[PDB]
């Protein structure tokens, strides 16, 4: 109350000393007295020190303090939001000095990252314009926070943000990924992964502003804090059509993916398998490109010795590629020569029913090519059938006939009767 007194005081030097105090108590590494401060009702008073007529130093501390109040539970954040502090935060980006903008931008970050509605709210307030205007500055600390806040405005796919509004950030974002600053590179990539999570139009917008080429470079960046969101972003782009996928291929994404398949991080290998599977779902030339990049050997090993979540992803990648054998038979002969059959069978006794369905499709494609070759050449046996039997795979396809799922039994039945009569 000695502090609160100096805050509600009319003395100019007292109101600043009191602001400095509330700031520091909320700037503590340990558990900040967030609720004790709100209890004093000093919120709207600090919102009042963010108005044009306040000294540069009183706005700096007032905003700083108000930022660490929004960085708390949704409730502590709503206390600041309803004290009509948002529009005053935005204006401060237009009128405050650098030090002051750094405080207001950060606060807009916590408010936007609290929920899809506070996000839409900050955007309705037209904060995009002044935020993008901030990057005409050279202060790395200011750039970092602005990229993070910008990040939170693109985030959220359930209630998706206004696209005619957030797509405006792309140009800025395309320049940002050429930054040498690690932290900045992290938030720029997150923002881009959010934006890339949309339809074919979004993806194409990310491509038109020329982001793919640098994004691929970032896959081999030193820090895994950069790689994760960059990988996700490159991943979303290949969920697009064949032409869009080709752009990422021409940027050299494949050699980069080969490196990521040996990543000490397990979730990076998983997302790299995922990414490759969407590339093998492409056309003949793209599947052939995956093969040339030497991606199958390390993808086959993962199918046999890795966390079940990764094995699944690897399964899709190889299964998708096998469907390419109809237009180019060497594709399947190649997968087989690399030993995909054993790791494929060994995955038939897994819990997931959709993976089993995808595994069985691969095996059938392999059995089919095996049959065409038998007839084309002068062979007496379907060689891929033997490989499967010797790998104990025929016994498993046999058990699948007693799986409650319909599609599974019906397919496991077609195989047995057609290739193992």
């Amino acid at each position: 109350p000695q502090m609160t007194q100096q805050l509600n005081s009319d003395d100019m030097q007292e109101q600043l000393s009191a602001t400095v105090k509330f700031r520091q108590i909320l700037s503590r590494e340990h558990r900040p007295p967030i609720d004790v401060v709100i209890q004093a009702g000093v919120v709207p008073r600090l919102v009042e020190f963010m108005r044009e007529n306040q000294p540069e130093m009183l706005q700096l501390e007032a905003a700083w303090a108000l930022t660490n109040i929004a960085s708390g539970t949704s409730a502590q954040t709503k206390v600041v939001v309803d004290a009509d502090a948002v529009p005053l935060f935005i204006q401060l980006l237009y009128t405050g000095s650098v030090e002051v903008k750094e405080q207001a931008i950060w606060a807009l970050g916590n408010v936007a990252g609290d929920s899809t509605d506070y996000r839409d709210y900050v955007l309705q307030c037209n904060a995009m314009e002044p935020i993008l205007g901030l990057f005409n500055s050279n202060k790395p600390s200011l750039i970092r926070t602005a990229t993070w806040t910008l990040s939170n405005l693109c985030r959220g796919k359930k209630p998706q943000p206004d696209w005619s509004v957030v797509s405006q950030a792309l140009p800025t974002l395309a320049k940002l990924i050429y930054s040498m600053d690690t932290e900045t590179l992290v938030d720029a990539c997150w923002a881009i992964s959010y934006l890339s999570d949309g339809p074919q139009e979004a993806i194409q917008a990310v491509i038109d502003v020329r982001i793919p080429k640098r994004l691929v470079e970032l896959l081999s960046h030193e820090s895994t804090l950069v790689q994760t969101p960059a990988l996700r972003a490159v991943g979303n782009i290949v969920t697009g059509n064949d032409l869009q996928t080709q752009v990422v291929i021409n940027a050299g994404v494949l050699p980069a993916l080969r490196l990521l398949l040996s990543s000490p991080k397990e979730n990076i290998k998983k997302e790299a398998c995922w990414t490759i599977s969407n590339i093998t779902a492409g056309n003949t030339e793209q599947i052939q490109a995956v093969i040339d990049a030497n991606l199958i050997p390390p993808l086959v090993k993962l199918l046999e010795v890795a966390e079940d979540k990764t094995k699944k992803e690897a399964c899709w990648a190889i299964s998708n590629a096998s469907s390419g054998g109809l237009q180019r038979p060497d594709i399947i002969r190649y997968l087989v020569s690399q030993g995909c059959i054993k790791p494929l069978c060994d995955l038939l006794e897994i819990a997931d029913n959709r993976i089993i369905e995808v595994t069985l499709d691969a095996l059938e494609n392999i059995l089919k090519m095996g049959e065409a070759d038998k007839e084309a050449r002068g062979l007496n046996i379907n060689e891929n059938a033997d490989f499967i039997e010797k790998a104990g795979g025929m016994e498993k396809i046999f058990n699948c006939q007693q799986n409650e799922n319909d599609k599974i039994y019906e397919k496991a039945y077609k195989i047995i009767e057609t290739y193992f009569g």
């Binding site: 700037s27 930022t67 960085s71 970050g109 997150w190 290949v238 998708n320």
Partner: peptide
């Protein structure tokens, strides 16, 4: 074949404390 969107969602930190 089939291009699959991601099933698991990803994002950075929702909020940050200034020091």
């Amino acid at each position: 074949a089939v291009k699959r969107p991601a099933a698991t969602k990803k994002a950075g930190q929702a909020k940050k404390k200034k020091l």
